[PDB]
Amino acid sequence: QDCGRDFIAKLTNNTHQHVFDDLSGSVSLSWVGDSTGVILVLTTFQVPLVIVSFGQSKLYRSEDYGKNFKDITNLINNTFIRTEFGMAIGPENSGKVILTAEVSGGSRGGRVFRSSDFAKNFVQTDLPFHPLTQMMYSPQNSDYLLALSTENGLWVSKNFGEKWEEIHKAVCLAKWGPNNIIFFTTHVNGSCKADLGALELWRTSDLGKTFKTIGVKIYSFGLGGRFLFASVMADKDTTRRIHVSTDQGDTWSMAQLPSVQEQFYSILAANEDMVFMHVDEPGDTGFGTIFTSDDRGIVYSKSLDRHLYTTTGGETDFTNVTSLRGVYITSTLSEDNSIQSMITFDQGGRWEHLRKPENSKCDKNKNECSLHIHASYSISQKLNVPMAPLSEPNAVGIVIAHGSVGDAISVMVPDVYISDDGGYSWAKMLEGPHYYTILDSGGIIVAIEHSNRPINVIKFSTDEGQCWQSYVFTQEPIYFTGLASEPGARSMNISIWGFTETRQWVSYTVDFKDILERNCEEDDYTTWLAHSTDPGDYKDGCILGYKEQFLRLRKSSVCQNGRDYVVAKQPSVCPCSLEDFLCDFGYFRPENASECVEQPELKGHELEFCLYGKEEHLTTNGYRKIPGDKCQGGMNPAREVKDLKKKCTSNFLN
Amino acid sequence: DCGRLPDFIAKLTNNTHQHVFDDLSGSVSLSWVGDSTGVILVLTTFQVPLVIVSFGQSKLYRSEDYGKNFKDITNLINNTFIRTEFGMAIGPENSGKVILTAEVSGGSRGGRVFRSSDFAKNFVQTDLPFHPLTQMMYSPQNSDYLLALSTENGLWVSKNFGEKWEEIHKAVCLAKWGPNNIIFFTTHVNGSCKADLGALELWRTSDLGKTFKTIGVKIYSFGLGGRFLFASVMADKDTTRRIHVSTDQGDTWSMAQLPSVGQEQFYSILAANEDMVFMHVDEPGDTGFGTIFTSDDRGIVYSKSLDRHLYTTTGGETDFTNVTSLRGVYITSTLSEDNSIQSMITFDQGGRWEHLRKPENSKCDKNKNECSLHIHASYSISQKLNVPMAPLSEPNAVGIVIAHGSVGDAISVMVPDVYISDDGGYSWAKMLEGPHYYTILDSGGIIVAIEHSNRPINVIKFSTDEGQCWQSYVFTQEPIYFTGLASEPGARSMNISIWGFTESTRQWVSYTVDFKDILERNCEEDDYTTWLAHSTDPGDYKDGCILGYKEQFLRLRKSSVCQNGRDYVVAKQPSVCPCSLEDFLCDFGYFRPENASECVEQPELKGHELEFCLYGKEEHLTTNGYRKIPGDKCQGGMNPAREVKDLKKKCTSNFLN
Ligand SMILES: *[C@@H]1O[C@H](CO)[C@@H](O[C@@H]2O[C@H](CO)[C@@H](O[C@@H]3O[C@H](CO)[C@@H](O)[C@H](O)[C@@H]3O)[C@H](O)[C@H]2NC(C)=O)[C@H](O)[C@H]1NC(C)=O
Ligand SMILES: *[C@@H]1O[C@H](CO)[C@@H](O[C@@H]2O[C@H](CO)[C@@H](O[C@@H]3O[C@H](CO)[C@@H](O)[C@H](O)[C@@H]3O)[C@H](O)[C@H]2NC(C)=O)[C@H](O)[C@H]1NC(C)=O
Ligand SMILES: *[C@@H]1O[C@H](CO)[C@@H](O[C@@H]2O[C@H](CO)[C@@H](O)[C@H](O)[C@H]2NC(C)=O)[C@H](O)[C@H]1NC(C)=O
Ligand SMILES: *[C@@H]1O[C@H](CO)[C@@H](O[C@@H]2O[C@H](CO)[C@@H](O)[C@H](O)[C@H]2NC(C)=O)[C@H](O)[C@H]1NC(C)=O
Ligand SMILES: *[C@@H]1O[C@H](CO)[C@@H](O)[C@H](O)[C@H]1NC(C)=O
Ligand SMILES: *[C@@H]1O[C@H](CO)[C@@H](O)[C@H](O)[C@H]1NC(C)=O
Ligand SMILES: *[C@@H]1O[C@H](CO)[C@@H](O)[C@H](O)[C@H]1NC(C)=O
Ligand SMILES: *[C@@H]1O[C@H](CO)[C@@H](O)[C@H](O)[C@H]1NC(C)=O
Ligand SMILES: [Cl-]
Ligand SMILES: [Cl-]
């Protein structure tokens, strides 16, 4: 190995232990705020919601980055927090922390402990209701809160939880929208479970003063990107159709999929540009089809066939690689019924098989050596996968994830794989399942073994996952409970907590400041360009029509980086090629193919769909520009959506 | 105190048999096969999705000397692996049938089973013409008759113990054996099963697939229990789901009759035997509690049995527990008016419920709602409480119940203790601190418990006097992370197997412990005492009366260390008891208030004619408020009367064809 390195001493005097005596129930630990030194340790209990129990949560606060903790349990005197609730941390730079508790003796309402200075000072407030779910911060204003009571009342606070007001009494689900909009479902005469498919979707812009009914016959609803979704039960055949709105519910249009029937729909992801939709195959055989939308979220086309989903739950391995724009990974079922990982580098326009890792000299079956990246489908299938793939936008290109080969042994015990180029290439870095975390904007990666035995080893990397070192952080191994990174782009502190076994809790805070004492210089970085699936240099590094140069620490780097891995210079526009286009409505890409062909059952038939009550006729060469793609020049295939005379029904709510 | 320091380590050290298994992946299952056969199977399984083809090798070990030695017989299942969901398909007791359902390591057109009819001493290999979606199910009437559902929703049946398979219907959602080799199954034509919920058809076959009969349409779900066939039917218009009951294998049906206004509520069958049905009905609003109703012996007419019965909102689990070691006894959990949890127990099959009594040596004395004992079952499980096992009892170990229990402290809820009852749950005593796995064997002559925690364990906690006395035995010097505890089958069994692993690459090991030398002395008359079951009505004249029958039970004296070879039931023929209030359910429209022995009419029904629909006929009920408990054999004494008078008016009690 050429990783090289002495580092023990730099960590030994930077490892801070705190023993928490006489703790029952689960222990939560959280850093509060960037560069505040604040850590909260909170004990919670698993108690049913309808049950009044006598208990006392313990609460500890550190203000020196985990070196010392003060018992501040007297603040939450005669209350306890439920494990499901935990803490209600606000936005990153908000300073808001709410501890939602219940009174030990029982009370008519819950009790919240509110802080607006990164948990340095709390005030107590009694609720006029029992919260059914944790309070929700409004993304636009952290002073606006909503909560659902145990009597299904929708409560709203304007002044950060001090004063609460009930605005509707029969609410099933409520979600914040943009600009402090509240969307919620309601019903009459019965329960929410009984009135499924007959709920009403309401909207509020006044924090509860006036309402608008934006949908009826509602089965469920959700938000994603700039899109509002609603599953509507039109016919009494229990058939459900997804309706999409981009104007906060004022106008709706049913999702238009090619070759429609009696299928189950699911939104995998959605941003400001497009919608990923999953549609189960008729028969509930465990695989479906991914469709991508246009920029209105209405017109869909085939993106990926045989997409695996869990029958009970609907989970898929669909993974947004947030560290590289336009990159998504998921799992499909081959014709040989072997699991495959597929990756797209163009937001679902084209998918390719995940490349085998280098140096894995396995060579028995062609479907062996295949790297399956584990996510929510693996989780749902009860595979030993403690974490989904992890990535951060500021840590450009880094993905850490559990993976397995085609062997049953590998599926029982997955390994930890690293990619530095957004998932184009992978390498096995750690044996066995681990919990992991990225911090210092990718400058530090930490992993901790997941097993039944107590652990005392931190595995860390400072060169974005290319070299790993083990640090024994204690001589009394602990049963692992949690791993938490200090927030912040240049954060260098991690917190491990766990127990020995009555049990004794302990937290270890490790500071990588002395490990990274040397600031990186020019030689410590290497440049790289993102992978593009079309051949040639001319589009090397192009993502959705944009070319940017990326930075990466050289292998064996041990130095603190202070710059962005995405160079803050002029991005160049790339020429359009096939990778910049989705297949059009009614077209698809066969496996390994770059060109779209028409779906066989649609050949000889006119391509038509309904766009807000109007019949539209589609003439196309088979391609349409990916939403958000900024390419100019080169490929420019034509398409035309001409308005017809006929009017159809694209909206089954009102 | 409990005993006087008896010497046991030497008697257990030479009877503890370790076997170290080398190179084991996946989950490790261990099962004794048969009574007094000496056969134990250890099987390696993998968590692999059904639709996925994988390369793997399950490992298979067989003991034939009661766990002292294990032979690697993996070559028998060479080039196959078994999914953890499937495990083994052990046949009925004393049948000798064992099926191992596996998939081929390279993939195949169908699954591969390994069939044994001599208690896993010899297996024959058989390839299936289909991929099984679920484990094959044995017919209760004939263990040679198997059925299974394929991955393509085809219903396959075998007449010769899995040797030859025949597909008898191709669009099946769920299939279940009835009596006399009857097959009930749901089917559809409009796409998938998930899409046709509420539009399925319920079919029946008595000919293993030759002739069929459609016994129901608009079916949402169906199930079997006791002599009762249940079907959930989605009536037209408003989506209102109603339970229909049939006692003639589906030839005729009648909708369940409950004394309440149609509130569009969710129904649930808690339990059912040859005599009656326990039904749980959620309160309108999905508020976490509901009401238990009991039926008559036809399963049609229900009455309130227990209010505020807690259920988990997602999944519908409850703490409803059948105390199988004492006839007529059931335990569950309710929500008090103070919104605190309570354990309620009935000794008369749901006629009357009482608060579980606090343990005598209580850990104490809204503040009074502490020290109340909550016995943990599936409600506690589904609420994610630290409860590794539900209450355990065996019919042969009369009166013995072992269960996890918590007091009203959030601390006690987080770390439940282990409680023992020797009288079917009337009285309880805390015996072990912290959650444990436990097993009963030797018809209650040996109770074994093992700590449940994150640390490796090496201690057996055992009792030879029905849980009154407990000793700790270190069975290994290398502690193991606990995986399984399995008793040898049999009324006089004395062998347990513990298996687990060290240092999570895991190294697996089994320990088989033989209590034979501990129980070398046979019990005699001096070691037993007699006891009578508890009855809620006062006076000796009904002491020990269970549902009309008075029986005397035996019980090993505290500190007993001897082998019992007789039944814990004394009286050859039970005497018939006089009827009293405990022998009567409340009638339709009546209920028992808390602590009350007498039934009173529900308030909303006073001033109205008690009427229900009985197989298309509108009936009128006049009653004193009581009806004999189905299965109760009491004679004489209290005789509250009732009349069901035909009103000669047609009603609809059957929303299926
Ligand atoms: C990771 O945790 C360590 C603690 O182990 C943090 O070190 C601490 O950083 C703070 C802020 O830079 C230092 O602030 C002090 O402020 C007072 C008041 O202005 C001043 O009088 C002191 O001279 C000092 O500047 C604090 O001393 C320092 N403690 C130690 C032990 O070095 C570190 O900031 C955390 N890392 C990151 C990136 O947040
Ligand atoms: C618990 O397990 C032990 C083994 O550790 C069992 O002891 C064994 O019992 C069997 C059957 O009673 C004995 O089998 C022998 O079979 C031959 C051939 O038929 C026969 O000639 C012998 O007379 C005897 O029956 C076996 O020798 C014996 N082994 C030991 C070590 O004691 C014990 O039966 C099990 N306990 C229970 C209650 O099942
Ligand atoms: C995948 O994740 C990335 C990063 O989290 C998302 O990109 C961000 O999208 C939001 C709007 O939804 C923008 O405000 C950010 O500026 C974007 N960041 C980057 C780095 O692109 C992306 O939208 C996600 N994809 C989907 C389908 O949700
Ligand atoms: C509760 O469990 C007991 C079993 O211990 C069931 O009672 C037995 O029922 C079977 C047939 O249903 C009879 O053959 C036994 O004779 C019964 N009792 C015993 C052990 O002698 C009882 O039916 C169960 N209750 C319910 C509602 O299922
Ligand atoms: C609150 O704390 C005080 C002492 O600080 C204690 O006496 C009191 O019992 C606590 N609250 C209750 C009612 O438990
Ligand atoms: C697609 O390419 C992969 C290799 O990346 C190959 O294994 C597979 O067979 C190809 N499929 C087709 C239809 O060409
Ligand atoms: C197991 O089967 C494989 C072929 O699948 C064969 O190569 C191997 O020799 C077999 N082993 C034994 C011991 O039968
Ligand atoms: C019934 O008795 C219990 C104690 O055994 C008591 O707690 C309860 O309050 C009594 N019922 C009523 C209605 O008061
Ligand atoms: Cl929106
Ligand atoms: Cl370790």
Author numbering:
A (entry chain A): 51 to 55, 58 to 312, 314 to 416, 420 to 557, 561 to 713
B (entry chain B): 52 to 416, 420 to 558, 561 to 713
Task: Provide passages from the article that reported this PDB entry.
Sortilin can trigger internalization of ligands from the cell surface via endocytosis and sorts ligands between several intracellular compartments, such as the trans-Golgi network (TGN), endosomes, lysosomes, and the secretory pathway. Sortilin binds and sorts a broad range of ligands, and dysfunction of sortilin has been linked to a wide range of disorders. Previously solved crystal structures of s-sortilin revealed that the Vps10p domain in fact consists of three domains; a ten-bladed β-propeller and two 10CC domains (10CC-a and 10CC-b) that have substantial interactions with the β-propeller. In this study, we detail that sortilin undergoes a conformational change within the three luminal domains and dimerizes while transitioning from neutral to acidic pH.
We determined the structures of the glycosylated luminal segment of mouse sortilin, s-sortilin, from crystals grown at neutral pH (pH 7.5, one crystal form, 2.1 Å maximum resolution) and acidic pH (pH ranging from 5.0 to 6.2, three crystal forms, maximum resolution ranging from 2.3 to 4.0 Å). The structures reveal two distinct conformations, a monomer at neutral pH and a dimer at acidic pH. The eight independent s-sortilin molecules in the three crystal forms grown at acidic pH all form homodimers with an identical interface and highly similar structure. The r.m.s.d. between the s-sortilin chains in the dimers is 0.80 Å for all of the 650 Cα atoms modeled. S-sortilin dimerizes through the top face of the β-propeller, i.e., the large side of the β-propeller disk opposite to the bottom face at which the 10CC domains are located. The predominantly hydrophobic dimer interface is large with a buried surface area of 4882 Å2 and is formed mainly by loops protruding from the blades. β-Propeller blades 1, 4, 6, 7, 8, 9, and 10 are involved in dimer formation. In the s-sortilin dimer the C-termini are in close proximity to each other with 37 Å distance between the two N713 Cα atoms. The s-sortilin dimer structures, crystallized at acidic pH, reveal that dimerization is accompanied by a substantial conformational rearrangement within the ß-propeller and two 10CC domains. Despite three internal disulfide bonds in 10CC-b, the three α-helices that form a small hydrophobic core in the s-sortilin monomer change their conformation into a three-stranded β-sheet in the dimer. In the monomer conformation, the s-sortilin C-terminus is exposed and pointing away from the β-propeller; whereas in the dimer conformation, it is interacting, through conserved hydrophobic interactions, with the rim of the β-propeller at blades 4 and 5.
